[PDB]
Amino acid sequence: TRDQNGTWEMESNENFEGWMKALDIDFALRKIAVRLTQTLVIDQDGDNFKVKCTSTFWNYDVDFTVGVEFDEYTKSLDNRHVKALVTWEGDVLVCVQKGEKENRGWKKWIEGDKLYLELTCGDQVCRQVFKKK
């Protein structure tokens, strides 16, 4: 399944600090972020996605179209410009964000009732798992 639409609750977060540190997020914000429960809400309609991440203190939202490059400003995350592209490799949704950081992007896939999210930046890999609400 390519179907990622739904509300998803984080169950596992490995190397969450290493990835944020790779992006140079402020130590004070990382210290609090590592404690927070996260929810992902995904609306998928053909190529068009709307992804909302939420936690008590900070959110992150991004819209994109699969297969269409977009010049992204990463906003309150790390205030950088990247050239983002999201495509499918089999049933894995793959985002590459070309820019200052090497190996920057993510991969999103479903295994049964679970959504797996691998976030990358430099030499760091953060692996997350969510269960569908």
Residues 5-24 vs ligand RET: string with x where CB under 6 A? ---------------x----
Backbone torsions φ then ψ of 11, nearest 5 degrees: -120, -20
Beta-carbon contacts of residue 86 (< 8 Å; ≥ 6 apart): 49, 64, 65, 66, 67, 93, 94, 95
Question: Looking at this protein, which amino acid is placed at residue 51?
Answer: V
Q: Does 33 bind ligand RET (CB under 6 A)?
A: yes
Provide the 10 A C-beta neighbour count for residue 20. Answer: 22
Select the span of 55-63, 64-72, 96-104 touching ligand RET (CB under 6 A): 55-63
Half-sphere exposure of residue 69: CA atoms within 13 angstroms, side-chain side: 5
Beta-carbon contacts of residue 98 (< 8 Å; ≥ 6 apart): 82, 83, 84, 85, 104
Closest distance of CB 108 from ligand RET, Å: 5
Closest distance of CB 38 from ligand RET, Å: 5
Q: Does 117 bind ligand RET (CB under 6 A)?
A: yes
Alpha-carbon gap, residue 101 to 119, rounded angstroms: 13
Closest distance of CB 95 from ligand RET, Å: 7
Of the candidate residues 9, 60, 80, 114, the single one contacting ligand RET (CB under 6 A): 60
Of the candidate residues 5, 6, 39, 58, the single one contacting ligand RET (CB under 6 A): 58
Binding site for ligand RET (CB under 6 A): 20, 33, 36, 38, 51, 53, 55, 58-60, 77, 106, 108, 117
